Design the sequence.
RNA sequence: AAACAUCUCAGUAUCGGGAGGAACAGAAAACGCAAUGUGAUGUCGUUAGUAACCGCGAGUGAACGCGAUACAGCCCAAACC
RNA sequence: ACUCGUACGGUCACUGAAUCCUGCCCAGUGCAGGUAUCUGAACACCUCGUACAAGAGGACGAAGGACCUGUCAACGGCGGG
RNA sequence: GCUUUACUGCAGGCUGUCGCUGAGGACUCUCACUCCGGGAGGAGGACACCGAUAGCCGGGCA
């Protein structure tokens, strides 16, 4: 079976959903953790410095 | 080659010819307190220690003459250029 | 390279764990205040998934219902006893001291009360040899002579299910079904059949280990494979 | 005349001698069964505490903290590293155990602030220190002319910024002259070179 | 560093914890133009690519002082109660 | 983790149903065991040195090695004359 | 990427030493410490564990 097109057919699972905390569709409903704001893992909001050029 | 154990020659101290006695420079021993010894202790750490980690050098197929010329009267020695010699044996 | 299979094991992932949730009971000797009065009756004989051997269900006088490591010869209705004064018949448990020398025993405790550690697999048995006020010498199925606290409790008889090893699996399928009831990754791929990156024996244009197969005890995990600290190898001599 | 305190001090100069020696042998046994952070009604070293700022007053807390001995508990590298950085065993943290203690203690008492801390011995693997903490919200401390300074907002979480006792000492700020070129007025401002 | 291991990139990138409107530092167990001298601390200019480091390679790199800015000096512990 | 497990176990490897079989070699390499003697670090100990110290030397000597043995269904070998 | 008796190092294993650590070149004990026991108590015991260091092995890894 091709890992391409023919393997695209089984993708009827729901994972990342609208996050109750930040409103982005990144709340992983299996993990109960948001990939965007960290809701469900961190009380503090997710944020890293590599999200921007070092000097900015 | 052969070399007389004693023979006349210029003494830079006396400033005049006199009988000198020839001896092979015996290697002095180290204190292990010179600057270089401290740097080795100081600078060596976790991982490669740089220069102090190097691989030992080689040897020339023959070494130069390493002698001391001891003046029979004033007792003060002096050094001279050496010269390649597979072996050096003194006579008497 | 990558961790070898021995190193994946350590991680205790699903593939390597034993189906605990499917196991029945942690066969251990009962705890008796003292007196030995404790007795019970054999209510049933069930199969132990963790040991591929029979296990006896017992109802004790004080209402306690527990499974027990059943020695050969135990049946329903039988009465088993546990304590210092327990009778000396198969199926009963009592300190090595109260046990007569020359009698086969199983499920021996290493230290009194631990609930039994030695001789519990199919048809095996220990052999109580010497007594004493201080030491109880027992020969474990491996043939070793084990000096033990005469207080350590043990069960009389030989473990049930003897002879299991006498019949060949015959076919992969049968190993398969057994292996699934254990904490083991199966089947086994030969190191020499792998790539260099995957096992010290992997690589080469043909299959053969790289270096000799006996490895030092000091070898680090990742390298410790093949013949471990072997004292000799082969059959000759 | 010598203060009664001066005796407590004298005894602790050599914690492995005489009476206190047998006291430690006794205590530690109970200590090793105690938690990481245990509040205690009274300082084991009265002279010490009082000397540090302690007072048998409302809003002043003391707690004993257990920290493991030894170098840094470090994980080996999982990627490329030059020899110099392939280190594991001999690496030690730049924060002394006493300071770790201060922090652990402080976290256990979120509303309180660290005043100072002192050692109280150590066995083969532990190290115990007692930390003096203060409730910057309890009047009596707000009204104490000798501690009310710790109630100031500028002091929120002193330990975590190293404004402590051992904090400043650990930051190499002891000397005012030679040696403190890279220490004062702050490690970070000196580009982290001490 | 015309490879590369100490060294360099750099205590940089990035990561963990935390304060404020500014932080941190701060009233000498200092300096050491060695003095009949200076006198808390930051910072700015300079001292200086000086001293010091370093396969003494490549590279790395202060301080006292001086001129300025702004200035500010105090509280416990203990002795005795 | 293996393990609600205990040598009729389980881990680590080689070979790859059955049938007839599986010879010779422990020198090298590996692993293991032993070891009079030899070698073998640091702490403590002794000597020299320094009103201390650096440092030099001595005594003692672990694992290891030398040395000896075992072992090839251990890596492998099984020629020239 | 991979290999090894390439160079340099790093984990890991073994071993000596120090601290925890106590009483009377071999030895007894118990009090720390460890394990077994529900508890009483039993085994072990100043060793082991752990922390520090030293020598050896060390493509498992960089
Ligand atoms: Cl010569
Ligand atoms: Cl099987
Ligand atoms: Cl704080
Ligand atoms: Cl001046
Ligand atoms: K580099
Ligand atoms: Mg793919
Ligand atoms: Mg080094
Ligand atoms: Mg069990
Ligand atoms: Mg079989
Ligand atoms: Mg069948
Ligand atoms: Mg399975
Ligand atoms: Mg296979
Ligand atoms: Mg292949
Ligand atoms: Mg490999
Ligand atoms: Mg083959
Ligand atoms: Mg083969
Ligand atoms: Mg380069
Ligand atoms: Mg600043
Ligand atoms: Mg160059
Ligand atoms: Mg630099
Ligand atoms: Mg200066
Ligand atoms: Mg095949
Ligand atoms: Mg336990
Ligand atoms: Mg490599
Ligand atoms: Na240094
Ligand atoms: Na191979
Ligand atoms: Na706090
Ligand atoms: Na520094
Ligand atoms: Na270059
Ligand atoms: Na290159
Ligand atoms: Na350098
Ligand atoms: Na001047
Ligand atoms: Na051989
Ligand atoms: Na051999
Ligand atoms: Na590649």
Sequence:
């Amino acid at each position: 079976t091709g890992a391409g097109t023919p393997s695209q057919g089984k993708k009827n699972t729901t994972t990342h959903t609208k996050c109750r905390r930040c409103g982005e569709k990144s709340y992983h409903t299996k993990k109960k953790v948001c990939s965007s704001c960290g809701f469900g893992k961190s009380a503090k909001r997710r944020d890293y410095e590599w999200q921007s050029k070092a000097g900015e | 080659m052969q070399m007389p154990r004693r023979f006349n020659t210029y003494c830079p101290h006396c400033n005049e010819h006199q009988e000198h006695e020839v001896e092979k420079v015996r290697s002095g021993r180290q204190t292990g307190m010179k600057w270089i010894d401290r740097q080795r202790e100081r600078n060596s750490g976790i991982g490669n220690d740089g220069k102090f980690s190097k691989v030992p050098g080689g040897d020339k197929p023959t070494k130069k003459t390493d002698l001391k010329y001891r003046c029979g009267e004033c007792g003060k020695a002096h050094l001279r250029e050496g010269w390649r010699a597979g072996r050096l044996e003194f006579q008497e | 390279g990558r961790r070898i299979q021995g190193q994946r094991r350590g991680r205790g992932t699903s593939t390597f764990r034993a189906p605990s949730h499917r196991y029945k009971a942690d066969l251990e000797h009962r705890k008796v205040e003292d007196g030995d009065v404790i007795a019970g009756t054999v209510v049933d004989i069930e199969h132990d998934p963790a040991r591929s051997a029979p296990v006896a269900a017992v109802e004790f006088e004080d209402g306690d219902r527990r499974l027990i490591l059943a020695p050969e010869g135990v049946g329903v209705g039988d009465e088993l006893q546990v304590g210092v004064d327990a009778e000396i018949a198969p199926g009963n448990t009592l300190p090595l001291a109260e046990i007569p020398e020359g009698v086969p025993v199983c499920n021996v405790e290493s230290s009194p009360g631990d609930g039994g550690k030695f001789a519990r697999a199919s048809g095996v048995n220990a052999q109580l040899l010497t007594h004493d006020r201080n030491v109880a010498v027992v020969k474990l199925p491996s043939g070793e002579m084990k000096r033990l606290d005469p207080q350590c409790r043990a069960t009389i008889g030989v473990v049930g299910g003897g002879g299991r090893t006498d019949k060949p699996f015959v076919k992969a399928g049968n190993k398969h079904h057994k292996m699934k009831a254990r904490g083991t990754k199966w089947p086994n791929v030969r190191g020499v059949a792998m790539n260099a990156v995957d096992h010290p024996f992997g690589g080469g244009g043909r299959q053969h280990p790289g270096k000799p197969k006996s490895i030092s005890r000091n070898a680090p995990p990742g390298r410790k494979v093949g013949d471990i600290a072997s004292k000799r190898t082969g059959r000759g001599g | 005349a010598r203060s009664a305190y001066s005796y407590i001090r004298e005894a602790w100069k050599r914690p492995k001698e005489g009476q206190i020696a047998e006291l430690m042998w006794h205590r530690m046994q109970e200590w090793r069964n105690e938690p990481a952070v245990v509040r205690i009604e009274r300082p084991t070293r009265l002279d010490r505490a009082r000397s540090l700022g302690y007072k048998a007053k409302q809003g002043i807390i003391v707690v004993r903290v257990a920290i493991r001995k030894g170098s840094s508990r470090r994980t080996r590298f999982n990627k490329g590293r030059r020899s110099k950085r392939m280190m594991v065993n001999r690496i030690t943290r730049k924060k002394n155990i006493q300071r770790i203690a201060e922090e652990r203690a402080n976290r256990k008492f979120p509303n309180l602030r660290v005043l100072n801390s002192y050692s109280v011995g150590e066995d083969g693997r532990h190290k115990w220190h007692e930390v003096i903490l203060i409730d910057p919200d309890h009047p009596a401390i707000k009204s104490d002319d000798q501690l009310s300074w710790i109630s100031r907002t500028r002091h929120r979480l002193r330990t975590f910024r190293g404004l402590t006792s051992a904090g400043r000492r650990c930051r190499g700020l002891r000397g005012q002259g030679k040696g403190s070129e890279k220490v004062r007025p702050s490690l970070r401002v000196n580009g982290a070179k001490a």
The radius of gyration of chain B is 19 Å. The longest helix of chain B spans residues 35-43. The beta strands of chain B are 2-4, 6-11, 16-24, 67-71, 77-78, 89-91. The domain at 1-92 of chain B is CATH 3.10.450.80 (Nuclear Transport Factor 2; Chain: A,).
